[PDB]
Amino acid sequence: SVPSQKTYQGSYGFRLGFLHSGTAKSVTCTYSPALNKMFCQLAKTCPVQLWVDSTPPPGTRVRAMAIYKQSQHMTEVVRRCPHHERCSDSDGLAPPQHLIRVEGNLRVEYLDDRNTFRHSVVVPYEPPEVGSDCTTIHYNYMCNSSCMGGMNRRPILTIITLEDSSGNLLGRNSFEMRVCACPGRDRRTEEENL
Ligand SMILES: [Sb+3]
Ligand SMILES: [Zn+2]
């Protein structure tokens, strides 16, 4: 079956925030509120902000999972193309088939679900650093949207679930993802069709 993508703020008032980076040619990662769509270059830092009304307990965990947006493709597992799967860009932690990685977190953990075969990456929730109102996770996407043998120009969603130490759903949110060479231009072009 297909993982739930239904928004759920839950007890702790869980929602996602994004940097306001604009669409200049030099930008590596930019978000479109209009499309609720993130545009990142291959393997480059993709900051996602966790916002809460109340601090969840210690041992709370944040999980990222990719699915295909279109109904006909939803049952197919999102994974890296054979080319990117084979290439030597391994960090020693991430499985080579996994699209979504986390950088600068040695407590990162990766799951091949034994039932659904779905890929996900999970880190411990940490409260905001002193002088901050949200928690930032740096994701890396390791395959282009245009990759034949992979996503093959098919739109994907990233599902961020907040869960406790025992794996109970606390909150869920989602955003569309495109991995492309010129994020600035592509966002500006996709917003032009409004
Ligand atoms: Sb990005
Ligand atoms: Zn690829």
Q: Solving technique for this entry?
A: X-ray
Which helix (DSSP H) or strand (DSSP E) does residue 132 occupy?
A: none
What are the tokens at 147?
A: 């990759």
Nearest to 99 by CA among 65, 149, 146: 65
User: Among all ligands shown, which has an atom nearest to the Cα of 153?
Assistant: 2
CB 145, CB 180: distance < 8 Å: yes
CA atoms within 13 A of residue 170's CA, in its CB half-sphere: 25
Other C-beta atoms closer than 10 Å to the C-beta of 190 total 16
Taking Cα atoms as reference points, which of 9, 1, 2, 55 lies closest to residue 169?
Answer: 9
Ligand 1 center from residue 89 Cα (angstroms) = 19
- Report d(CA 154, CA 30) in Å as an integer: 19
Q: 116 C-alpha to center of ligand 2: Å?
A: 22
Q: How many residues does the chain have?
A: 194
The full DSSP string for 83-99 is HHHHSS---SSS-TT-S
Contact 161, 123 (CB under 8 A): no
Q: Which ligand is nearest to the CA of 150?
A: 2
Å resolution of this model? 2.5
Residue ranges in the chain assigned as alpha helix (H): 82-86, 183-192
